[PDB]
Design an enzyme around this catalytic site. Structure first.
Site, PDB file in Angstrom:
ATOM      1  CD  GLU C 423      -1.289  -0.119   3.695  1.00  0.00           C
ATOM      2  OE1 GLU C 423      -2.046   0.874   3.669  1.00  0.00           O
ATOM      3  OE2 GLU C 423      -1.286  -0.944   4.632  1.00  0.00           O
ATOM      4  CD  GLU C 432       2.708   8.341  -0.011  1.00  0.00           C
ATOM      5  OE1 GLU C 432       2.679   7.141   0.335  1.00  0.00           O
ATOM      6  OE2 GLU C 432       1.925   9.200   0.449  1.00  0.00           O
TER       7      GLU C 432
END
Ligand SMILES: Cn1nccc1COc1ccc2c(c1)CCN(C[C@@H](O)CNC(=O)c1ccnc(NC3CCC3)c1)C2
Ligand SMILES: Cn1nccc1COc1ccc2c(c1)CCN(C[C@@H](O)CNC(=O)c1ccnc(NC3CCC3)c1)C2
Ligand SMILES: Cn1nccc1COc1ccc2c(c1)CCN(C[C@@H](O)CNC(=O)c1ccnc(NC3CCC3)c1)C2
Ligand SMILES: CSC[C@H]1O[C@@H](n2cnc3c(N)ncnc32)[C@H](O)[C@@H]1O
Ligand SMILES: CSC[C@H]1O[C@@H](n2cnc3c(N)ncnc32)[C@H](O)[C@@H]1O
Ligand SMILES: CSC[C@H]1O[C@@H](n2cnc3c(N)ncnc32)[C@H](O)[C@@H]1O
Lengths: 300, 625, 625, 322
Positions: C423, C432
């Site tokens: 995730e 990210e």
């Protein structure tokens, strides 16, 4: 279960093995005491003679005769636990909170009725185990007391060493009981010589073991035995004893009278915390470590 | 109420322990985040690969409990300034690890000890941690009043304690702090947890600390005496120190075991609360000033800008100031006209700077009090306040008061005044340009006229305060000189500071200025004897003023007007702190400079070492004329 | 509750009037600080020297009442943009006077009208007032939806109203605002008081306003219809607009006289409160997001820094996200091993980035749900979370889960995994560094292995928002580029904004990357058709992700996962706003750049006009690898 | 992070003393590594790790022609612009003997192991140009009995007094950065209008190959300087010495400076605030060599006679990209 960080191992005169352990990680930070009349079966909780749980971790312990057990606790307490008469239960006798910090070292004096405790509160205390009170409280050091060790024959004499780089010989018969025995590296372990009542040995945080004659304040001999802090020193029961040294480098060493190495063991995978010689087989040396190992070595 | 915490080094069950210490009544718990005896290896095997978990789980408490109830304690075996390189590296790694875990838990404060002279590598690691990541944890440096080496029993035969006194030696602990916070460049997140011993040091050692950022005071149970009923108590001097700390609003940490074993543990905290309830009651000034402690306030413009309505509203409620003004006007009216003239002689009074009319009503009351006749002019340059003045003159005052919307320097007076009354004094007396205004106004004062205030004088005193130095440092703003914040005076209710010498007069002004060459520029040199070792960070400023003869106002601490809240002290900082030894003299120099457009102060320290001349040519702070 | 005020132009007694309107239930009162008919002369005599008072006294109310209950209104005769020079000068002086009196009273807001095209001198005077003195009053520009010239009755014979439609003409009022706030350089103290007429304009005019800083909505009594019982009501479209304004939390001002004279005046406010109580109930996402509206959040470092415990605690409570993950793992386990193998085949699952173990328990639940055997690895680079993981593995999980304290790019896996679960997605999916991490990890995935998420894609949409543009402008910090705040993306719950075109896909990543030359650098061009006149200030960014086949997550508005609060949209600002006309196309270009140490985005607008290439070579924003 | 320009190579190629010392080191090493009875049977693998335009390559060729021994040459260079020069020279002159390798020495998978590795990665403070990290990344293809030239190097520090250089550093304040960042970085400067306050003392030392299992280039050092005048301390001058091979040495330390060697100027570590020192007082300074996976930097603080702030913490003002 038995807390993983095995802290102390002591052989009794009849051959039994006393284990003191503490939980230095996890949910609960407590401790436990165990007695195995079969020492080879340690550390199996179902193969023991007796076992009890303390409230805090065991920083150090020592036998008090044949049934007594003196414990220095993380809670700032000194606690005497007496063994069962059937030797199947360990019951607390007293538990006095007299130190303002962790009690890190205890030692029974030669009479067997008094003890000396050192703590991170920088003070040393003399205990009358019968009256369960503190006889004297000294504050001679300037840092946490790493080790105290009673003289084997003189009831009023004991050694102390602390992080203020001081090693102190104590004769409580003098108005000033402490005497400084000389600055290199901090002393961590102290072991009186079993025969010569004026010779001892001390290890430092740098891995060096030195032999000291208290008559002349000068190192008679020294040797770099370990690469890290020397946490303990135990003499063998032989007529001419051997010197067992344990350290944070996870190794055990057995040296002779001139500090020459005769045995070296790396069977431990974490810090080696205590070593004790078998009174039944003088070549047998039992060590404990934070890897939860109870190793039985055959020293040549 | 007392914000108090419990220090512990043994926590078997965090839930049980926290519940117990909270039932005892504490507000937070100082505990270790790793087991203090659980030493860890980071370099060499096999201890390098010790299977985890390394400590207890963060799930044992909620996020709010971690954020509000837990203070972290650095493990005692961590020694970054050890002389063994292995121990140095392991302690660096473990200190970074424990600080990062404290930041992970969101701990409000973390405890680190200062128990030796050399803490250079500790400061290096702490500064690097502060400049790494985004965390907001405070760092409490645990430092004792007296070092343990100077507290040890005299029981070592061949190493006796030096019974001779050393002035700076018994201060050594402060140096331990001073160097540390100096290596960390006065980080606002690094505060002092001062630990009190059984025997207090001499007064000067305790005097050093009270200007420092003390956030916690640690009280071991071993320092508590035993009273007649068996409860733990403190000595009278310890009570005095506790009172001083309560004025500083520090948090009190109780450490050690329970030595009064007949009573419970909450008795120590009960005695602390007892002392807090029985503290000396605050005076009126301390009540009015509560909330402004060490709050810096930038320089305002008394002539360029106009005052707001709420400002008049709050500064109108000072009864002592205006009662003193009324007494001055009353005595002046009585001394200016005899009783046989009480009906034949009307006195021309001019309130130069009337605001909303508090001095106008003061003059009316003083006339009704002296039974003399007055003719009132109320001159005010702020038109918004002129609205208030004219509404009051229509509703109440009437023909007697004439409202004049003008600057007193600009107003062409129709007649000359017997008395001119003003309240143009700032915190440094003349820093709000009262001399220039009254000089521009004194041309319509009668040759025998009286000015109230008659005279005023400013006072300076060197101070020590890391708190206020950091507060000034934090005033750096973009788009200006990175050091301009040090070259301007601030109004501030000084609190966490140390006055180093007695206040001495700086500048003096009289009205009317009976000199043909009226020059308000000044140059003054002040010598301050210092009888302690300290660090100078600036100069506090006060003032006194003679309104009329024996009628006076003063914010000078020794002669402060009781209950007068209108003026807070002023603060002239310096860019760099200056070390002062015992017996040395702080020599400072102050200039009052001006041109046709503005007025400003310049100041420099010339002893024991020279500072830079601060605010030259008014480049950082001026007062618009 | 509704924050509502009463507008008045006639106040005989301020105490009486305020008491009456407060008894009616209003929260504040919009009134004139000078009598609106009281014109004042400033230049030529004799009217220059009109004896005061110029207005009513500030003593008629308390400071708190002035600060919380009174909104000032500029006098209607003040016209700084008049074409008569005398009127211009008098209006300049009077506008400065009234604004200074409003600042003196400490009024929270002051009302000024925009009722014509040319308000240049008005803006000059207002900007000079804003840059003079220290005051914190808001300035509400009163501007109508439809100008009065376009609302007049068609009753002038020789000047009929143009019945033909003009798209930009009916928008003219917005231009009146746009120029004004442009002349004042987007001052944060200058907001919109939008005045609603009887006949609403077309939809596009109303669409323009909702990205603007509207602080008040003004509702004349003349626009209220009459229902069957005689109470004042609104039309359905007016109710829709009122709902949209209630989402923006504007204050509602009721002006005009009481036209429903059978009922009292509080009936209009009662109907407003009725609409507020009967508003559409907020969904779960709108409840979770309440408080974050238009709050900018700077870029974080997913690899350089470690996440705090509270962050895991809050983002662990997203049931939709983890139920979707559980469903993905369950479907994958069922599709990877048949029922006849349910006991013979154990599946190697590797949670690459386990945190505190929500995906570990999701995998356990999915295995218990699919009745299949799994072997779990939980890899985590954050050691603080590894503590939690190891405590859970000792207390609960056991032999099944193996905790691996390492970076997935660094971990030498002992075996290969059938399934890898992660995730690592940010608000812009790959911002990210999920591609780099999964590329470094995919070498221990079986040749037939599955990655969850299977793929992800980012989306961009041009937006209009003076609010968020000002919020980004206010992020200028000392000791860096004065325009660096425009060259970095922000996470923000977008609210006071206008989406100008449909979101279009930007970057796409798949796992495992079945290409020999794995290159995560990207260059993309997007063309957005715009069908309104508007001002572009930046680009909103969303993402979608395929976890497994039909199992998906999305923060894209059209396909948003219901009740999922974990991800807020992202915002790529631009240094300078760009005007876009109706029918024009916004062409933007985005680069995903990287070197061995960091990854960053670069973006530039190329149509209808070119912007500067933003964040070149990552000089203002990078993501540490 | 950056690549050197052509003129830089051109000017720093004209240092005859430096390269004659390198040639002597290589010559002595070749003579001490293979006897005369093996002069034809034994070819030595030499790797110039960082060849530039090839001055050490020709130095190795000359040292081999001087020792009458056989060599096999690799010329590794990470700067491609200089690789152009190297490959043109290898086509025109060198030939089969020299193999040009366009790569970083930390990244290069060597086909064989080298008997000798030669490099000139030393800055003014020896290790401030990341010679330890590069040679650590390269020493895995050095033979177990292999030799690195330079064999070792050491940095030296000395407290200095200079209002001139303090003002010069103060004048380096730039917009859009810390107003005191100019004090937290070292400068290369031909020191002139200054006063050396104490004798230079060794700071950091590095050896190659690093025969330690835990190769750690992070350092912490404390230096005590006796001062026998009243003065004002403004910074610390930095020099270095290096053992290329046995008695073959280079040095910019003033007492042992290599004659006529212009390649290295001293370095200067300033301090934000000047520190007054009295006669007889001791200047105690502390220097850290810090690093992470991406960069290396120095941190320094004065602790006696008064404490300064810890300069350049966590590399916020000066780092050396790896
Ligand atoms: C003519 N007229 N009509 C109606 C009323 C008036 C008098 O109007 C004024 C207006 C302003 C001032 C004065 C009189 C005299 C004092 N002067 C002090 C400044 O020079 C420096 N500031 C401080 O010291 C300061 C700052 C903040 N809070 C403080 N005290 C707190 C404690 C609770 C209040 C003190 C400002
Ligand atoms: C492994 N593990 N174990 C336990 C728990 C976990 C999962 O831990 C995490 C930790 C962080 C994140 C995630 C998961 C996924 C989402 N991700 C979003 C960022 O990329 C961008 N931020 C936002 O969008 C944002 C900012 C502020 N508030 C927001 N929402 C408000 C509304 C009430 C909360 C959203 C951050
Ligand atoms: C491989 N190859 N191929 C062809 C050539 C080469 C060698 O190439 C280089 C390139 C650069 C450097 C070297 C060698 C070694 C020295 N090193 C010194 C720096 O570390 C610090 N700078 C100074 O000290 C400095 C600054 C300015 N002027 C100075 N001297 C003046 C006096 C007249 C010149 C000295 C830079
Ligand atoms: C009580 S603070 C001083 C008062 O006098 C007023 N004042 C200050 N300077 C002047 C001046 N030069 N002329 C007239 N009023 C002044 C200020 O506006 C304030 O009301
Ligand atoms: C839920 S946010 C992503 C999670 O995975 C972890 N993570 C991110 N990147 C990596 C990585 N490269 N290796 C291992 N864990 C990672 C983070 O620390 C966080 O717990
Ligand atoms: C003479 S300056 C050092 C020389 O070696 C080169 N160099 C520096 N570091 C490396 C490296 N890591 N790998 C290869 N060449 C390098 C530089 O580009 C320069 O030519």
């Amino acid at each position: 279960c038995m807390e993983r960080q095995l802290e102390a191992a002591r052989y009794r005169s009849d051959g039994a093995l006393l284990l003191g352990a503490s939980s230095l990680s996890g949910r609960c930070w407590a401790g436990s005491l165990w007695l195995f009349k079969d020492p080879c079966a340690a550390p199996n909780e179902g193969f023991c003679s007796a076992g009890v749980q303390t409230e805090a971790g065991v920083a150090d312990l020592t036998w008090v005769g044949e049934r007594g057990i003196l414990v220095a606790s993380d809670s700032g307490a000194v606690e005497l636990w007496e063994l069962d008469e059937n030797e199947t239960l360990i019951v607390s006798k007293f538990c006095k909170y007299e130190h303002d910090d962790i009690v890190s070292t205890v030692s029974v004096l030669s009479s067997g009725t008094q003890a000396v405790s050192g703590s991170k509160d920088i003070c040393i205390k003399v205990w009358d185990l019968a009256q369960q009170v503190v006889l004297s409280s000294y504050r001679a050091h300037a840092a946490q007391v790493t080790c105290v060790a009673a003289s084997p024959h003189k009831d009023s004499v004991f050694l102390s060493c602390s992080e203020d780089n001081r090693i102190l010989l104590w004769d409580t018969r003098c108005p000033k009981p402490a005497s400084q025995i000389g600055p290199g590296y901090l002393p961590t372990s102290l072991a009186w010589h079993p025969q010569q009542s004026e010779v001892f040995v001390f290890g430092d945080e740098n891995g060096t073991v030195s032999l000291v004659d208290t008559k002349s304040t000068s190192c008679v001999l020294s040797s770099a035995v370990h690469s890290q802090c020397v946490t303990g020193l135990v003499f063998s029961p032989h007529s001419v004893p051997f010197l067992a040294s344990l350290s944070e480098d996870c190794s055990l060493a057995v040296l002779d009278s001139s500090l020459s190495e005769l045995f070296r063991s790396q069977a431990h995978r974490d810090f080696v915390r205590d070593a004790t010689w078998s009174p039944l087989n003088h070549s047998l040396l039992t060590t404990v470590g934070w890897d939860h190992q109870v190793v039985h070595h055959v020293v040549p | 109420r007392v914000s108090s915490g419990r220090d512990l080094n043994c926590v078997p069950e965090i839930a049980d322990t926290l519940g117990a210490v909270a039932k005892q009544g504490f507000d937070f718990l100082c505990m270790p985040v790793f087991h203090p005896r659980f030493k860890r290896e980071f370099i060499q095997e096999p201890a390098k690969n010790r299977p985890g978990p390394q400590t207890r789980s963060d799930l044992l408490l909620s996020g709010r409990d971690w954020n509000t109830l837990i203070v972290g304690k650095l493990s005692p075996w961590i020694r970054p300034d050890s002389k063994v390189e292995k121990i140095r590296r392991n302690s660096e790694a473990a200190m970074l690890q424990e600080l990062n875990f404290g930041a992970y838990l969101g701990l409000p404060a973390f405890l680190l000890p200062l128990n030796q002279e050399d803490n250079t590598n500790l400061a290096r690691v702490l500064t690097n941690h502060i400049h790494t990541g985004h965390h907001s944890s405070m760092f409490w440096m645990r430092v004792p009043l007296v070092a343990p080496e100077d507290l040890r029993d005299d029981i070592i035969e061949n190493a006796p304690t030096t019974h001779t006194e050393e002035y700076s030696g018994e201060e050594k602990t402060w140096m331990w702090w001073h160097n540390f916070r100096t290596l960390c460049d006065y980080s606002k997140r690094i505060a002092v947890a001062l630990e009190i011993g059984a025997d207090l040091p001499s007064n000067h050692v305790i005097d050093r600390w009270l200007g420092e950022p003390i956030k916690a005071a640690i009280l071991p149970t071993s320092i508590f005496l035993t009273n007649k009923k068996g409860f733990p108590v403190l000595s009278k001097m310890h009570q005095r120190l506790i009172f001083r700390l309560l004025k500083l609003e520090v948090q009190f940490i109780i450490t050690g075991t329970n030595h009064h074993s007949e009573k419970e543990f909450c008795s120590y905290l009960q005695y602390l609360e007892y002392l807090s309830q029985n503290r000396p009651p605050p005076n009126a000034y301390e009540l009015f000033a509560k909330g402004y402690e060490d709050y810096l306030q930038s320089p305002l413009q008394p002539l360029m800008d106009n005052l707001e309505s709420q400002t008049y509203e709050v500064f109108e409620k000072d009864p002592i100031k205006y009662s003193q003004y009324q007494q001055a006007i009353y005595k002046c009216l009585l001394d200016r006209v005899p009783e046989e003239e009480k009906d034949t002689n009307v006195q021309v009074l001019m309130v130069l700077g009337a605001g909303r009319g508090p001095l106008v009503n003061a003059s009316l009351r003083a006339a009704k009090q002296a039974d003399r006749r007055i003719k009132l002019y109320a001159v005010e340059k702020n038109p918004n306040a002129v609205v208030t003045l004219e509404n009051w003159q229509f509703e109440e005052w009437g023909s007697q008061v004439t409202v004049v919307s003008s600057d007193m320097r600009e107003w062409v007076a129709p007649e000359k005044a017997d008395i001119i009354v003003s309240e143009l004094l700032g915190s440094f007396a003349d820093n709000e340009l009262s001399p220039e205004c009254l000089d521009g106004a004194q041309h319509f004062l009668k040759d025998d006229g009286v000015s109230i205030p008659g005279e005023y004088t400013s006072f300076l005193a060197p101070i020590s305060s890391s708190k206020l130095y950091n507060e000034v440092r934090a005033c750096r703003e973009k788009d200006r000189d990175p050091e301009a914040q040090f070259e301007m005076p601030y109004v501030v209710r000084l609190h966490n500071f140390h006055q180093l010498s007695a206040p001495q007069p700086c500048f003096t002004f009289s009205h009317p200025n009976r000199d043909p060459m009226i020059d308000n520029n000044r140059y003054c040199t002040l010598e301050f004897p210092v009888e302690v070792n300290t660090v100078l960070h600036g100069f506090a400023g006060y003032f006194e003023t003679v309104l009329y003869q024996d009628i006076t106002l003063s914010i000078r601490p020794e002669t402060h007007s009781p209950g007068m809240f209108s003026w807070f002290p002023i603060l002239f900082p310096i860019k760099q702190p200056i070390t002062v030894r015992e017996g040395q003299t702080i020599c400072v120099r102050f200039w009052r400079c001006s041109n046709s457009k503005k007025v400003w102060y310049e100041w420099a320290v010339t002893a024991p070492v020279c500072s830079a001349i601060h605010n030259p040519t008014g480049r950082s702070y001026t007062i618009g004329l």
